[PDB]
Design a protein around this motif. Structure first.
Motif, PDB file in Angstrom:
ATOM      1  N   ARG A 100       3.512   1.426   0.219  1.00  0.00           N
ATOM      2  CA  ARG A 100       4.519   1.852   1.186  1.00  0.00           C
ATOM      3  C   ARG A 100       5.318   3.059   0.683  1.00  0.00           C
ATOM      4  O   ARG A 100       5.941   3.761   1.483  1.00  0.00           O
ATOM      5  N   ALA A 130       2.771  -3.886   7.778  1.00  0.00           N
ATOM      6  CA  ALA A 130       2.761  -2.425   7.707  1.00  0.00           C
ATOM      7  C   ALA A 130       2.534  -1.783   9.075  1.00  0.00           C
ATOM      8  O   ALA A 130       2.545  -0.553   9.178  1.00  0.00           O
ATOM      9  N   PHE A 154      -3.069   1.647  -0.817  1.00  0.00           N
ATOM     10  CA  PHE A 154      -2.112   2.588  -0.246  1.00  0.00           C
ATOM     11  C   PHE A 154      -0.758   1.895  -0.127  1.00  0.00           C
ATOM     12  O   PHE A 154      -0.588   1.011   0.709  1.00  0.00           O
ATOM     13  N   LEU A 192      -8.436  -2.974   4.844  1.00  0.00           N
ATOM     14  CA  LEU A 192      -7.637  -4.159   5.077  1.00  0.00           C
ATOM     15  C   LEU A 192      -6.235  -3.673   5.378  1.00  0.00           C
ATOM     16  O   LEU A 192      -5.621  -3.066   4.523  1.00  0.00           O
ATOM     17  N   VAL A 193      -5.731  -3.957   6.576  1.00  0.00           N
ATOM     18  CA  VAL A 193      -4.383  -3.532   6.954  1.00  0.00           C
ATOM     19  C   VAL A 193      -3.443  -4.724   6.973  1.00  0.00           C
ATOM     20  O   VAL A 193      -3.712  -5.721   7.631  1.00  0.00           O
ATOM     21  N   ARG A 214       3.777   1.889   9.856  1.00  0.00           N
ATOM     22  CA  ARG A 214       5.191   2.124   9.579  1.00  0.00           C
ATOM     23  C   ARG A 214       5.417   3.467   8.900  1.00  0.00           C
ATOM     24  O   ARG A 214       6.514   4.020   8.996  1.00  0.00           O
ATOM     25  N   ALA A 240       4.509  -4.630  -0.496  1.00  0.00           N
ATOM     26  CA  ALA A 240       4.620  -3.200  -0.766  1.00  0.00           C
ATOM     27  C   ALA A 240       3.340  -2.436  -0.430  1.00  0.00           C
ATOM     28  O   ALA A 240       3.294  -1.210  -0.608  1.00  0.00           O
ATOM     29  N   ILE A 241       2.318  -3.136   0.051  1.00  0.00           N
ATOM     30  CA  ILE A 241       1.048  -2.503   0.381  1.00  0.00           C
ATOM     31  C   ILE A 241       0.956  -2.257   1.883  1.00  0.00           C
ATOM     32  O   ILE A 241       1.277  -3.135   2.684  1.00  0.00           O
ATOM     33  N   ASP A 242       0.546  -1.055   2.258  1.00  0.00           N
ATOM     34  CA  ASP A 242       0.276  -0.769   3.672  1.00  0.00           C
ATOM     35  C   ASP A 242      -1.160  -1.153   4.049  1.00  0.00           C
ATOM     36  O   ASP A 242      -1.372  -1.961   4.962  1.00  0.00           O
ATOM     37  N   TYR A 243      -2.136  -0.599   3.330  1.00  0.00           N
ATOM     38  CA  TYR A 243      -3.511  -1.003   3.527  1.00  0.00           C
ATOM     39  C   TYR A 243      -4.320  -0.740   2.264  1.00  0.00           C
ATOM     40  O   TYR A 243      -3.866  -0.038   1.352  1.00  0.00           O
ATOM     41  N   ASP A 253       8.126  -3.015  -5.688  1.00  0.00           N
ATOM     42  CA  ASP A 253       6.811  -2.572  -5.220  1.00  0.00           C
ATOM     43  C   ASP A 253       5.731  -3.090  -6.179  1.00  0.00           C
ATOM     44  O   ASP A 253       4.777  -3.751  -5.763  1.00  0.00           O
TER      45      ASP A 253
END
Ligand SMILES: O=c1ccn([C@@H]2O[C@H](COP(=O)(O)O)[C@@H](O)[C@H]2O)c(=O)[nH]1
Ligand SMILES: O=c1ccn([C@@H]2O[C@H](COP(=O)(O)O)[C@@H](O)[C@H]2O)c(=O)[nH]1
Ligand SMILES: O=c1ccn([C@@H]2O[C@H](COP(=O)(O)O)[C@@H](O)[C@H]2O)c(=O)[nH]1
Ligand SMILES: O=c1ccn([C@@H]2O[C@H](COP(=O)(O)O)[C@@H](O)[C@H]2O)c(=O)[nH]1
Ligand SMILES: O=c1ccn([C@@H]2O[C@H](COP(=O)(O)O)[C@@H](O)[C@H]2O)c(=O)[nH]1
Ligand SMILES: O=c1ccn([C@@H]2O[C@H](COP(=O)(O)O)[C@@H](O)[C@H]2O)c(=O)[nH]1
Ligand SMILES: [Cl-]
Ligand SMILES: [Cl-]
Ligand code: NA
Ligand code: NA
Ligand code: NA
Ligand code: NA
Ligand code: NA
Lengths: 59, 56, 56, 58, 57, 56
Positions: D20, F50, D18, F45-46, F18, D52-55, B52
């Motif tokens: 995961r 995800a 944010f 930003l998405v 997700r 590893a980033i969602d947003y 991560d």
């Protein structure tokens, strides 16, 4: 000759412990490595393991 | 051909894995898809997709 | 280029998916990203990204 | 065109990342590569993988 | 290579088994490299292939 | 190599992430790997990786 290309291919033929993304652990012997796969023997079983499912390998 | 992860070669870092583990590691190599580390007396091949973030 | 999964075409295997499911599967086709299977009377397209490993 | 991305436009900005894993990083962005975002979080330096980033809120 | 079996699902009504456990009863209306476009009842969805585990057809 | 997501630019959508979160969003931009949105007063930003699916 690109030294820092793929370390996993050097595992071919070796005893390893494979830690999978769901928490499973394979006590394995590596029998083949491709770009996306590691072939192993685990006990009596033959497995094709996808690298994307592996977290890390102890060797 | 640039990766920030290459800056960490030879360094002590904390690797935060997607499985919740935190590796207290010394980096011994960095490939496109993997980071090779020493954690105690153990040699690990860590896939970047399983990381991560890394604190350095 | 090379993949071992293509050599499973025509085999009956156990596909262990990332959700913990196992498919007792006859492989009928393999592409770069997909494995086509018959599971009993059902026809499935399985994405390789969803597979953890395959016992054959 | 090739390799356009919005994430590098967050370079040098304060953002909320944010992850995961449910964590939220209050971060300053210091670098952006194709696969990584470098951040300062308080006095910590982190290399964050984009996967590893969602947003990111900015 | 770079063949996709998923393209052949265009026009079929299928069951999409998503990675979270949801299942869509979905009429496929389009397929790209990374996406499957579907109609689920009166709803139009863009489904990312990365979120799909398997598809029954 | 075509992508349908580009045509979501400027539209009201519901984004199913997700992690189980749902964004009631307006799309402000689309790149190969990202979708930019406004959610109320927030700018996000998405990452596409995800997202599970988008209702539009
Ligand atoms: O040349 C390659 C291509 C892929 N991979 C491995 O395969 C993974 C791809 O998994 P996926 O997310 O694309 O399914 C990479 O993260 C990496 O671990 C390699 O080791 N070498
Ligand atoms: O040239 C490359 C290719 C991949 N990666 C890393 O490997 C991951 C591959 O993960 P995946 O393909 O399994 O999803 C990427 O997200 C990225 O962190 C790199 O650093 N450099
Ligand atoms: O030429 C390719 C492309 C992909 N894959 C494998 O298939 C995965 C993606 O398949 P899918 O389930 O994501 O559709 C890749 O990450 C890799 O493991 C291959 O073996 N060869
Ligand atoms: O040129 C690139 C390559 C990767 N990524 C990001 O890094 C992630 C790495 O995941 P993967 O492509 O290894 O699956 C992508 O999903 C995307 O969010 C980019 O933004 N640009
Ligand atoms: O030409 C392509 C590229 C990608 N994919 C699918 O889309 C996924 C992209 O999601 P990911 O790479 O982030 O997992 C691939 O793994 C694969 O299932 C294809 O079917 N064809
Ligand atoms: O040209 C691209 C590359 C990636 N993606 C999206 O970003 C995700 C992660 O990128 P990658 O793994 O395919 O590189 C893919 O699953 C897909 O949803 C696209 O839509 N188009
Ligand atoms: Cl090494
Ligand atoms: Cl078939
Ligand atoms: Na990796
Ligand atoms: Na990934
Ligand atoms: Na990444
Ligand atoms: Na996808
Ligand atoms: Na993405």
């Amino acid at each position: 000759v690109i030294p820092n290309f793929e370390y996993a291919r050097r595992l071919n033929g070796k005893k390893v412990k494979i830690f999978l993304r769901n928490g499973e652990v394979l006590d394995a012997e590596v029998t083949g490595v491709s770009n996306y796969e590691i072939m192993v023997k685990v006990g009596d079983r033959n497995l094709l393991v996808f690298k994307h499912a592996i977290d890390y390998i102890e060797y």
